[PDB]
């Protein structure tokens, strides 16, 4: 199967772009392997790998655009990248048609 | 029909982990960082390391087949040391464990994490 896609945009609390970049899922990195199984298989999944990709700052917005609706484990990443920052985390996915939302904001 | 089963595997690892608002409960083929062959369930917990299952639960392998990965839809424990995964529609996967683990303590993992 072809490999999971996701657009992540950190924008801070001014406007300015801080990452734009594109991702995929699979093929883990020696940095991945070395946290150990299985966090290490759950660590390659796009929105853990994005939540990975970049610090945030307080105020900052990290929106990921997936493709599927978000796994367990994607979840907590976000959430726990979003409390953990002092940031907000925005997650979208097609579903019927329409780009779906959910949002974690850590409130410092 | 009889329920079809799609994967037959010896494991030599259980571990159990909530982490980051996320039950984990792996299947190792091998104790190495990189086993050659997986199942990992996972479900969202109300709280960090901790607090009530909660949500859709979700199955993944490293393996080549086809599943729904929301298709869990309970378990049963097989002799000799199998935990037998009842996958939709009508699909299972056996997970023979080696002697060592503890399969009732796996089995109440597996009650945690298919509760309500």
Redesign the interface.
């Given at each position: 199967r072809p490999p999971h896609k996701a657009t992540v945009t950190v924008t801070d609390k001014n406007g300015v772009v801080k990452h734009k970049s594109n991702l995929v899922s699979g093929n883990?990195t020696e940095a991945e392997?070395?946290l150990?199984?299985?966090?290490?298989?759950?660590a390659t999944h796009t929105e853990n790998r994005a939540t990975r990709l970049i610090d945030l700052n307080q105020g900052d917005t990290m929106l990921i655009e997936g493709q599927y609706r978000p796994?367990?484990?994607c979840?907590?990443?976000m959430?726990?990248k979003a409390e953990e920052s002092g940031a907000k985390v925005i997650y979208t996915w097609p579903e019927d048609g329409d780009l779906k939302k959910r949002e974690w904001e850590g409130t410092p | 029909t009889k329920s079809k089963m799609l994967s037959n595997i010896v494991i030599q690892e259980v571990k159990f982990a909530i982490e980051d608002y996320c039950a984990i409960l792996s299947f190792a083929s091998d104790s190495y960082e990189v086993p050659e062959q997986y199942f990992i369930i996972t479900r969202s917990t109300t709280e960090r390391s901790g607090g009530i299952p909660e949500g859709d639960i979700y199955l993944e392998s490293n393996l080549f087949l086809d599943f729904n990965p929301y298709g869990l839809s309970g378990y049963l424990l097989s002799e000799p040391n199998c935990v037998d995964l009842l996958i939709e529609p009508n699909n299972y996967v056996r997970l023979r464990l080696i002697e060592k683990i503890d399969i009732l303590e796996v089995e109440n993992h597996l009650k945690f994490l298919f509760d309500n």
């Open positions: 883990m392997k070395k150990g199984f299985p966090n290490n298989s759950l796994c367990p484990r979840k907590g990443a959430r726990v | -």
